[model samples]
Target: GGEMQKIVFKIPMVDDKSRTKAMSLVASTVGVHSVAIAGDLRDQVVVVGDGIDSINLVSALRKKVGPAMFLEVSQVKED
Candidate 1:
Protein backbone atom coordinates (compact mmCIF):
# COMPACT_ATOMS: atom_id res chain seq x y z
CA GLY A 1 0.00 0.00 0.00
CA GLY A 2 0.98 3.64 -0.49
CA GLU A 3 1.54 6.29 2.17
CA MET A 4 -1.07 8.81 3.19
CA GLN A 5 -1.09 12.38 4.53
CA LYS A 6 -3.28 15.47 4.88
CA ILE A 7 -3.11 18.82 3.15
CA VAL A 8 -4.73 22.00 4.37
CA PHE A 9 -5.61 25.02 2.27
CA LYS A 10 -6.24 28.49 3.64
CA ILE A 11 -8.23 29.75 0.73
CA PRO A 12 -8.85 33.48 0.77
CA MET A 13 -12.54 33.37 -0.02
CA VAL A 14 -15.66 33.28 2.13
CA ASP A 15 -17.96 32.09 -0.64
CA ASP A 16 -18.71 28.51 0.24
CA LYS A 17 -19.93 27.65 -3.24
CA SER A 18 -16.75 28.73 -4.99
CA ARG A 19 -14.54 27.21 -2.32
CA THR A 20 -16.40 23.95 -2.60
CA LYS A 21 -16.00 23.91 -6.35
CA ALA A 22 -12.30 24.67 -6.19
CA MET A 23 -11.66 22.13 -3.43
CA SER A 24 -13.66 19.49 -5.23
CA LEU A 25 -11.78 20.08 -8.43
CA VAL A 26 -8.49 19.83 -6.56
CA ALA A 27 -9.45 16.64 -4.76
CA SER A 28 -10.70 14.95 -7.92
CA THR A 29 -7.92 16.01 -10.23
CA VAL A 30 -5.14 15.41 -7.68
CA GLY A 31 -6.27 11.93 -6.63
CA VAL A 32 -6.91 12.99 -3.06
CA HIS A 33 -7.81 10.15 -0.70
CA SER A 34 -10.41 12.34 1.02
CA VAL A 35 -11.42 15.98 1.64
CA ALA A 36 -12.98 18.15 4.32
CA ILE A 37 -14.04 21.79 4.64
CA ALA A 38 -13.89 23.56 7.95
CA GLY A 39 -15.30 27.00 8.56
CA ASP A 40 -14.40 29.20 11.49
CA LEU A 41 -14.25 32.86 12.44
CA ARG A 42 -10.72 33.19 11.18
CA ASP A 43 -10.65 31.66 7.69
CA GLN A 44 -12.10 29.11 5.29
CA VAL A 45 -10.03 25.95 5.47
CA VAL A 46 -9.93 22.92 3.22
CA VAL A 47 -8.29 19.68 4.30
CA VAL A 48 -7.44 17.02 1.75
CA GLY A 49 -5.19 14.09 1.02
CA ASP A 50 -1.50 14.81 0.60
CA GLY A 51 0.43 12.38 -1.48
CA ILE A 52 3.31 12.46 -3.93
CA ASP A 53 1.12 13.95 -6.64
CA SER A 54 -0.20 16.78 -4.48
CA ILE A 55 2.59 19.22 -5.30
CA ASN A 56 1.95 19.18 -9.01
CA LEU A 57 -1.79 19.40 -8.41
CA VAL A 58 -1.35 22.41 -6.15
CA SER A 59 0.82 24.04 -8.81
CA ALA A 60 -1.94 23.56 -11.35
CA LEU A 61 -4.45 25.00 -8.92
CA ARG A 62 -2.23 28.02 -8.27
CA LYS A 63 -2.20 28.62 -12.00
CA LYS A 64 -5.94 28.31 -12.17
CA VAL A 65 -6.60 30.52 -9.16
CA GLY A 66 -4.11 33.08 -10.50
CA PRO A 67 -2.06 35.57 -8.48
CA ALA A 68 -4.84 37.89 -7.33
CA MET A 69 -7.50 35.57 -5.91
CA PHE A 70 -5.71 32.64 -4.30
CA LEU A 71 -3.86 33.11 -1.06
CA GLU A 72 -1.70 30.93 1.20
CA VAL A 73 -1.55 27.13 0.72
CA SER A 74 -0.04 24.50 3.00
CA GLN A 75 0.09 20.81 3.97
CA VAL A 76 0.05 18.62 7.10
CA LYS A 77 1.16 15.16 8.11
CA GLU A 78 -1.25 12.46 9.21
CA ASP A 79 -0.95 9.14 10.97
Candidate 2:
Protein backbone atom coordinates (compact mmCIF):
# COMPACT_ATOMS: atom_id res chain seq x y z
CA GLY A 1 0.00 0.00 0.00
CA GLY A 2 3.05 2.26 0.23
CA GLU A 3 4.88 2.03 -3.05
CA MET A 4 5.56 4.85 -5.51
CA GLN A 5 5.40 4.28 -9.24
CA LYS A 6 4.52 5.92 -12.52
CA ILE A 7 1.47 5.33 -14.69
CA VAL A 8 1.82 6.65 -18.20
CA PHE A 9 -1.33 7.21 -20.26
CA LYS A 10 -1.25 7.47 -24.01
CA ILE A 11 -3.82 10.03 -25.11
CA PRO A 12 -3.92 11.37 -28.63
CA MET A 13 -3.81 15.08 -29.51
CA VAL A 14 -3.90 16.19 -25.91
CA ASP A 15 -3.80 19.97 -25.63
CA ASP A 16 -3.22 22.42 -22.78
CA LYS A 17 -6.83 22.46 -21.61
CA SER A 18 -7.09 18.72 -21.86
CA ARG A 19 -3.87 18.35 -19.92
CA THR A 20 -5.21 20.53 -17.12
CA LYS A 21 -8.43 18.57 -16.95
CA ALA A 22 -6.65 15.25 -16.93
CA MET A 23 -4.22 16.37 -14.25
CA SER A 24 -6.94 17.80 -12.08
CA LEU A 25 -9.06 14.70 -12.50
CA VAL A 26 -6.23 12.35 -11.64
CA ALA A 27 -5.18 14.53 -8.70
CA SER A 28 -8.75 14.47 -7.42
CA THR A 29 -8.57 10.74 -6.96
CA VAL A 30 -8.11 9.52 -3.38
CA GLY A 31 -4.86 7.66 -3.86
CA VAL A 32 -3.08 9.59 -6.59
CA HIS A 33 -0.19 11.72 -5.34
CA SER A 34 0.96 13.79 -8.29
CA VAL A 35 0.42 14.26 -12.01
CA ALA A 36 2.48 15.35 -15.01
CA ILE A 37 1.91 15.75 -18.73
CA ALA A 38 4.46 15.28 -21.50
CA GLY A 39 4.89 14.01 -25.07
CA ASP A 40 5.94 15.41 -28.39
CA LEU A 41 2.77 14.18 -30.00
CA ARG A 42 0.74 15.65 -27.13
CA ASP A 43 -0.10 12.17 -25.92
CA GLN A 44 1.06 11.30 -22.44
CA VAL A 45 -0.17 11.62 -18.87
CA VAL A 46 2.18 10.54 -16.13
CA VAL A 47 0.79 9.78 -12.69
CA VAL A 48 2.95 8.96 -9.72
CA GLY A 49 2.32 7.89 -6.14
CA ASP A 50 1.38 5.09 -3.79
CA GLY A 51 -1.93 3.32 -3.18
CA ILE A 52 -3.04 4.66 -6.55
CA ASP A 53 -5.55 2.59 -8.44
CA SER A 54 -4.50 2.69 -12.07
CA ILE A 55 -7.75 1.08 -13.12
CA ASN A 56 -9.73 3.72 -11.35
CA LEU A 57 -7.71 6.52 -12.97
CA VAL A 58 -8.33 5.10 -16.44
CA SER A 59 -12.04 4.72 -15.87
CA ALA A 60 -12.41 8.22 -14.52
CA LEU A 61 -10.21 9.66 -17.27
CA ARG A 62 -12.68 8.31 -19.79
CA LYS A 63 -15.10 11.02 -18.68
CA LYS A 64 -12.55 13.76 -17.97
CA VAL A 65 -10.42 13.84 -21.10
CA GLY A 66 -10.74 10.58 -23.04
CA PRO A 67 -9.71 6.96 -23.13
CA ALA A 68 -6.02 6.25 -23.47
CA MET A 69 -4.78 3.85 -26.11
CA PHE A 70 -2.05 2.56 -23.81
CA LEU A 71 -1.42 2.56 -20.09
CA GLU A 72 2.14 1.89 -19.00
CA VAL A 73 2.31 1.03 -15.32
CA SER A 74 5.92 0.53 -14.37
CA GLN A 75 8.50 1.00 -11.62
CA VAL A 76 11.60 1.04 -13.73
CA LYS A 77 14.34 3.41 -12.64
CA GLU A 78 15.62 6.11 -14.96
CA ASP A 79 19.03 5.64 -16.57
Candidate 3:
Protein backbone atom coordinates (compact mmCIF):
# COMPACT_ATOMS: atom_id res chain seq x y z
CA GLY A 1 0.00 0.00 0.00
CA GLY A 2 1.17 3.52 -0.65
CA GLU A 3 1.46 6.03 2.18
CA MET A 4 -0.07 9.47 2.10
CA GLN A 5 1.13 12.72 3.67
CA LYS A 6 -0.75 15.74 4.89
CA ILE A 7 0.74 19.21 4.66
CA VAL A 8 -0.72 22.28 6.22
CA PHE A 9 -0.06 25.89 5.23
CA LYS A 10 -1.37 29.13 6.62
CA ILE A 11 -2.09 31.41 3.67
CA PRO A 12 -3.17 34.97 4.00
CA MET A 13 -6.26 35.71 1.94
CA VAL A 14 -7.28 39.35 1.94
CA ASP A 15 -9.49 39.03 -1.09
CA ASP A 16 -11.38 36.55 -3.24
CA LYS A 17 -8.61 36.48 -5.81
CA SER A 18 -6.09 35.31 -3.22
CA ARG A 19 -8.34 32.49 -2.04
CA THR A 20 -9.00 31.23 -5.56
CA LYS A 21 -5.35 31.55 -6.48
CA ALA A 22 -4.20 29.61 -3.42
CA MET A 23 -6.65 26.77 -4.06
CA SER A 24 -5.74 26.60 -7.73
CA LEU A 25 -2.04 26.65 -6.96
CA VAL A 26 -2.11 23.72 -4.56
CA ALA A 27 -4.72 21.69 -6.43
CA SER A 28 -2.75 21.92 -9.66
CA THR A 29 0.52 20.84 -8.07
CA VAL A 30 1.84 17.49 -9.17
CA GLY A 31 1.64 14.63 -6.62
CA VAL A 32 -1.08 16.37 -4.65
CA HIS A 33 -4.04 14.08 -3.96
CA SER A 34 -6.40 16.71 -2.64
CA VAL A 35 -6.62 20.19 -1.15
CA ALA A 36 -8.91 21.34 1.62
CA ILE A 37 -9.48 24.56 3.53
CA ALA A 38 -9.01 24.27 7.28
CA GLY A 39 -8.54 26.20 10.54
CA ASP A 40 -11.18 28.17 12.41
CA LEU A 41 -11.02 31.08 10.04
CA ARG A 42 -10.41 28.82 7.04
CA ASP A 43 -7.06 30.49 6.49
CA GLN A 44 -5.22 27.20 6.56
CA VAL A 45 -4.86 25.00 3.49
CA VAL A 46 -4.54 21.25 3.91
CA VAL A 47 -2.80 19.34 1.14
CA VAL A 48 -2.72 15.56 0.96
CA GLY A 49 -0.49 13.55 -1.29
CA ASP A 50 2.53 11.31 -1.64
CA GLY A 51 6.09 12.50 -2.29
CA ILE A 52 5.05 16.13 -2.40
CA ASP A 53 7.88 18.61 -2.51
CA SER A 54 6.75 20.94 0.27
CA ILE A 55 9.69 23.28 -0.10
CA ASN A 56 8.83 24.17 -3.67
CA LEU A 57 5.15 24.47 -2.79
CA VAL A 58 5.85 26.86 0.06
CA SER A 59 8.22 28.95 -2.03
CA ALA A 60 5.65 29.35 -4.75
CA LEU A 61 2.91 30.15 -2.27
CA ARG A 62 5.02 32.81 -0.63
CA LYS A 63 5.66 34.45 -3.95
CA LYS A 64 2.15 34.16 -5.37
CA VAL A 65 -0.16 34.04 -2.37
CA GLY A 66 1.63 36.78 -0.44
CA PRO A 67 3.00 35.45 2.90
CA ALA A 68 2.70 31.68 3.38
CA MET A 69 3.84 29.47 6.22
CA PHE A 70 4.73 25.80 6.18
CA LEU A 71 2.95 24.83 9.36
CA GLU A 72 3.30 21.07 9.65
CA VAL A 73 3.31 17.67 7.99
CA SER A 74 1.84 14.39 9.17
CA GLN A 75 1.52 10.81 8.03
CA VAL A 76 -1.83 9.73 6.65
CA LYS A 77 -3.18 6.26 6.15
CA GLU A 78 -4.28 5.50 2.65
CA ASP A 79 -7.75 4.03 2.45
lDDT scores in order: 0.54, 0.77, 0.87
Q: How well is each residue in 1-79 modelled by candidate 2, as lDDT tens digits?
A: 5557888998764467887888889899877778888777767888888778777778888876876755687873644
Candidate 3 at residue 74, lDDT? 95
- For all predictions, the C-alpha RMSD in Å is 4.1, 2.5, 1.5
At residue 45, candidate 2 shows an lDDT of: 86
- TM-score order of candidates, top first: 3, 2, 1
What ranking of all candidate models by lDDT puts the best one first? 3, 2, 1
TM-score of each: 0.57, 0.81, 0.89
Q: What tens-digit string does per-residue lDDT give for candidate 3 at 8-74? A: 9988788778878998999889789899877887789999998889999999999888799888889
Which window of ten consecutive residues has the lowest lDDT sum in model 2?
70-79
The CA lDDT at 37 in model 1 is 55
| Candidate 3 local distance difference test against the native | 0.87
Q: List the residue pairs that clash in candidate 1.
A: none
